[PDB]
Structure 1
Amino acid sequence: SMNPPPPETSNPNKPKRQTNQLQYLLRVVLKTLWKHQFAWPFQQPVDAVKLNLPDYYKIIKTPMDMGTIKKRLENNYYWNAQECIQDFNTMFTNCYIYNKPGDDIVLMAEALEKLFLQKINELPTEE
């Protein structure tokens, strides 16, 4: 069971903005999670062939990862902060949907999500 194409990261016809909230999502939120010791399983799409998870992309129909989020932010792909926040939440939820409680990967996601939520709590007001 093969891998799907990754999520879209480029679309010239999509309206997009560079806002102070989206800048915070890159400079604070993404950067903080990316450097974390538990980030690496989330820094690129799940390679379900290499990990031998032939059911992964049958169960996870809206895949997301921080490599995709990083590219979207670096490309100014988003219209607003909530679109990007949704991507992070999809990533975390997908982890909890696919895996067992207490699994290492879940503990890793939980550590990243705690930091995510702390940073989002201080999202600046839109300028």
Structure 2
Amino acid sequence: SMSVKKPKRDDSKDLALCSMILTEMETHEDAWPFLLPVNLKLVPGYKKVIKKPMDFSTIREKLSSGQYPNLETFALDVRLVFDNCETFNEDDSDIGRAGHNMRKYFEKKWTDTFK
């Protein structure tokens, strides 16, 4: 509260660490469904069903241009990619499995790096 400060985590390396994790995700062999925005004019149903589209190249642009206030907002966008994927794809489709694999990969890196 006012003039009563909680001890705060050192956040000075967060930008660099999130960039490193994003690089690891960008180069994973199962990243291919997520590298670019879904083409809303070629993919039936996507525009209407998925209210907040997100993809790795959009996350990279936002990280490079100071649009994440903190590391939690970055993780929210990464998780949005995989949440969208589950909404639109069967668990045992190629894209569906790819999403489950990539979420598992991300969450371990996140835990190992920050938690």
The worse-fitting range, judged by mean Cα deviation, of 69-78 and 80-89 is 69-78
Q: 1:24-63 counterparts in 2 under 5 A?
A: 24-27=17-20, 29-50=21-42, 53-63=43-53
**1:44-97, CA deviations, whole angstroms, 9 ceiling, x for partnerless residues?**
1001323xx221110000111001001111212211000000001111000001
Shift of 1:23: 1.9
- Number of matched pairs: 105
Does the 8 Å contact 1:20/1:124 carry over to 2? no
Q: Structure 2: which 5+ residue stretches go unaligned?
A: 1-10
Consecutive unaligned residues of structure 1, counting only runs of 5 or more, are 1-17
The letter for the 2-side match of 1:24 is L
Equivalent residue, structure 1, for 2:90: 100
Correspondent of 1:23 among 16, 28, 38: 16
- Could you tell which deviates more after superposition, 109-118 or 81-90? 109-118
Q: Residues 19 and 80 of structure 1 are in contact (CA less than 8 Å); yes or no, is this contact kept in structure 2?
A: no
The whole-number CA distance in structure 2 between the counterparts of 1:124 and 1:63 is 26
Q: Report the RMSD for the aligned CA atoms in angstroms.
A: 1.6
Q: What amino acid is aligned across from residue 62 of structure 1 in structure 2?
A: K
Counterpart CA distance in 1 for 2:94 and 2:59 is 23
* TM-score, reference length from structure 1: 0.76
More helix per residue: 2
Q: Which residue, 110, 113, 124 being the options, matches 2:114?
A: 124
- Give the TM-score taking structure 2 as reference length: 0.83
Q: Give the CA deviation at 1:123.
A: 2.9
Correspondence for 1:90 among 74, 77, 80: 80
